[PDB]
């Protein structure tokens, strides 16, 4: 049951990607439209890169229906359906119109769906099923890409048409809407429950009609009972009946007692003494029993809280370095595999490309599924180590090919093995990412971590090209094999924190060392501001009024500053871990 939900939700997250990039370009090329210089385009791609920007809204606000995750999912999906149907109805026959604008809107909705789906996956899945869920979601997303790319395009070419294709996709998205309506909802208690407590308590102060005292007090009582059993922040690790947990329970016990007293007064028809009872409740609220509370009721907290959560932990920078460079070898192989097969070896483009497509698809799916099953049967760290070693070793198939003869079977075998190991590593990586989140700020943290993982993959092109054009292909692939060692070293460095999180299920809190972590955070913030200024300058340059050459220097200066901050943070993190070891 749950696995079907994961599969269909991954299908949904993968469905809307192609219509803004490939099918739209095909539609323009058929109708003799260039789709260039429209000034709204080139932002459809930028939605997916910068989807981490509007993340805090997804976890700060709880919509007044379903839950926090499911309500957002339904709103995003229905917005997507309306937008896609509108896109189908729009006819570029007269002129381009705002078609790029609608495409930008659809891209934004799809990015929001991705954020919320990742957050829900992180929230609902248990520790053992993380790998299986990641594998099934990956399977669903690849299936969505497959159906959107070729099948729908062929159907529009032969039977349905460009007019009916988008209605078909909307009709296909509807069943996933009822699926997420049927989907389970996780639990989110403390901050939200105390927020509804405070809202109804403030409503009690304005209560004058003698009837909304009772209903308000009922809401407060249900919220207090729910929040009694949840755990507060900084007490997550002291979960199994700790004295501080006992005092938490004692305070909520007294709070519910005062609520019952006020409710007893209000059932008697009194109002003024009920108001005095709520005032006494608020007075005892202010006392020292108030030890833990929530992030909301302020705008600044909705943004600042996830960052402080993540960067207050221990192992915060080593995990960052691991995420940046774990799948480097696969990126180095993929960057020029096809160029190698076309020029480095004498193979035709068409059949070889198609067979590579099929073999890579099947092999990565099989690798992901097998890794998911093995990780269900194993610990996370051991599976990560095994799969990293395997994906590092499998790259040597291409060195073997480049030195060996020109038979197709050897190339097929090497491709199959490489994509299998890639799928295994992908499943383990997504499991690690889902482990690392917080279930309170899961959306923001997961989006930031995914973008951070892609950042390391982005800058591989020029170096790979220079190496392959300078020293050759077999040397390039031996180097690519030798490049998978840093990820394994990072995995072996931080195994203690991984096993601690596997056992206690809670991340620790850093306390040692001076305020050098603050200096590193300041460096990172300065680098981010410099990157934002550079992006704004590039946006202004897009108007072609004035061009500058020092932006290249500014970008690399900002990158060096950010990387220096990250490396200093990581060395401090490792030193602290070896200090608590010693």
């Amino acid at each position: 049951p749950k696995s079907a939900i994961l599969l269909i939700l991954g299908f949904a997250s993968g469905l809307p990607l192609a219509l803004t990039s490939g099918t739209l370009q095909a539609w323009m090329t058929v109708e003799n439209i260039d789709l260039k210089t429209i000034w709204f385009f080139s932002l459809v791609g930028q939605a997916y890169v910068f989807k981490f920007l509007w993340s805090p809204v997804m976890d700060r606000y709880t919509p007044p229906f379903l839950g926090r995750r499911r309500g957002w999912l339904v709103t995003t999906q229905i917005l997507l359906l309306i937008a896609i149907a509108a896109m189908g109805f729009l006819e570029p026959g007269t002129q381009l119109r705002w078609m790029a604008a609608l495409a930008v809107v659809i891209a934004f909705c799809s990015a929001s769906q991705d954020i919320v789906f990742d957050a829900w996956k992180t929230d609902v899945l248990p520790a053992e099923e993380r790998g299986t869920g990641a594998a099934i979601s990956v399977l669903g997303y690849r299936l969505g890409m497959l159906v959107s790319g070729g099948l729908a395009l062929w159907m529009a070419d032969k039977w349905l048409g460009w007019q009916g294709m988008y209605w078909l996709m909307a009709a296909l998205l509807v069943p996933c809407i009822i699926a997420t309506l049927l989907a389970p909802e996780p639990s989110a208690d403390l901050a939200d429950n105390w927020e509804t407590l405070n809202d109804n308590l403030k409503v009690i102060e304005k209560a004058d009609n003698a009837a909304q005292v009772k209903d308000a007090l009922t809401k407060m009582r249900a919220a207090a009972l729910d929040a009694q059993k949840a755990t507060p922040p900084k007490l997550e690790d002291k979960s199994p009946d700790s004295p501080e947990m006992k005092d938490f329970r004692h305070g909520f016990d007294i709070l519910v007692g005062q609520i019952d007293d006020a409710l007893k007064l209000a059932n008697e028809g009194k109002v003024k003494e009920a108001q005095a009872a709520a005032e006494q409740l608020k007075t005892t609220r202010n006392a020292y029993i108030q030890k833990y509370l929530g992030v909301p009721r302020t705008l600044e907290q909705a943004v600042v809280a996830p960052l402080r959560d993540f960067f207050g932990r221990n192992n915060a920078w080593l995990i960052l370095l691991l995420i940046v460079l774990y799948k480097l070898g696969d990126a180095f192989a993929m960057s020029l595999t096809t160029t190698f097969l076309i020029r480095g070896v004498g193979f035709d483009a068409g059949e070889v490309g198609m067979v590579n497509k099929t073999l890579g698809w099947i092999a990565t799916i099989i690798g992901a599924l097998y890794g998911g099953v093995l990780m269900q049967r194993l610990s996370l760290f051991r599976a990560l180590l095994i799969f990293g070693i395997l994906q590092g070793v499998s790259n040597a198939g291409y060195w073997l090919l480049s030195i060996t003869d020109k038979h197709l079977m050897s190339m097929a075998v090497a491709v199959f093995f490489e994509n299998l190991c890639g799928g295994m590593g992908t499943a383990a990586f997504v499991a690690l990412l889902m482990t690392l989140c917080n279930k309170s700020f899961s959306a923001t943290q997961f989006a930031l971590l995914s973008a951070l993982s892609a950042v390391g993959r982005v800058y591989v092109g020029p170096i790979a090209g220079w190496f392959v054009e300078a020293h050759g292909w077999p040397t390039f692939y031996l180097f690519s094999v030798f490049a998978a060692v840093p990820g394994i070293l990072l995995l072996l460095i931080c195994r203690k924190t991984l096993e601690y999180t596997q056992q206690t299920e809670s991340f620790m809190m850093r306390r040692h060392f001076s305020g050098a972590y603050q200096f590193a955070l300041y460096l990172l913030l300065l680098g981010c501001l410099l990157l934002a200024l550079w992006l704004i300058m590039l946006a202004l340059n897009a108007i072609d009024y004035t061009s500058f050459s020092f932006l290249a220097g500014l970008l690399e200066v900002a990158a060096l500053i950010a990387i220096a901050g990250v490396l200093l943070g990581a060395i401090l993190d490792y030193l602290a871990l070896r200090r608590t070891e010693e």
Epitope: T218, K219, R221, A222, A223, L225, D226, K229, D253, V256, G257, D260, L263, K264, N267
Partner: antibody, heavy 124, light 109 residues
Framework: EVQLVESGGGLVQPGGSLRLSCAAS????????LHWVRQAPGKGLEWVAY????????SYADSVKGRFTISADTSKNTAYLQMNSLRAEDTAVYYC?????????????????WGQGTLVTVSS | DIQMTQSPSSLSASVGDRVTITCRAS??????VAWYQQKPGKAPKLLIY???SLYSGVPSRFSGSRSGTDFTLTISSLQPEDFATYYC??????????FGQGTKVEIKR
Amino acid sequence: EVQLVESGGGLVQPGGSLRLSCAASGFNVVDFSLHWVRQAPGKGLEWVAYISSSSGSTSYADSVKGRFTISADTSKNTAYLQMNSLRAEDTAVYYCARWGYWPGEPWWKAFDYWGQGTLVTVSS
Amino acid sequence: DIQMTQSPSSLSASVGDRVTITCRASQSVSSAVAWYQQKPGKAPKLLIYSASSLYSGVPSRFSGSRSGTDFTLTISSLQPEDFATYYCQQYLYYSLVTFGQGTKVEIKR
């Protein structure tokens, strides 16, 4: 030697008044709030009234308010439910359940001990 | 007065099959739901309290769980003695006590 016995069915005027007693042996009525629950013949349960003698609190359901009155005496270790101006729909089996004090596990095991029931039937 | 629209509304299963009963609270109630079994001609007995916790005296066959505002009662191995009426009661406050409808399923053999 532990039990909770209810009594009170008898011959009264139709649409008149009648008092029921719930005497509990093995535990005092001070320590547990006493609730009267009615089940109609063939239909489901519904909570009718409650009295708590620790604070003197008392409450009645909306569909019965203003006509019933539930009292108790702790020296005799029993509670009473006096029903006046009865209507045809009132006939049912009355159980006298108990509920523990907040806080603790006594509150959470609501209506842990029940009663054999008394058939209060109103008719002419 | 608002319930989810469902096409399959009835059940038909034989002896020895795992069975489940569900009820949904209209608003948030916390984990204050109890499950009672009443055999014909007797006062109801307390099967489950807190929707998941259990005291002494009851067979380990019965279990309960909660998700959101849904509460479920599970029986693993159906027995000849399990045929009675089953009530879920929310008992949030002393005065706001409400009972469920009740579910009785007959004998399959």
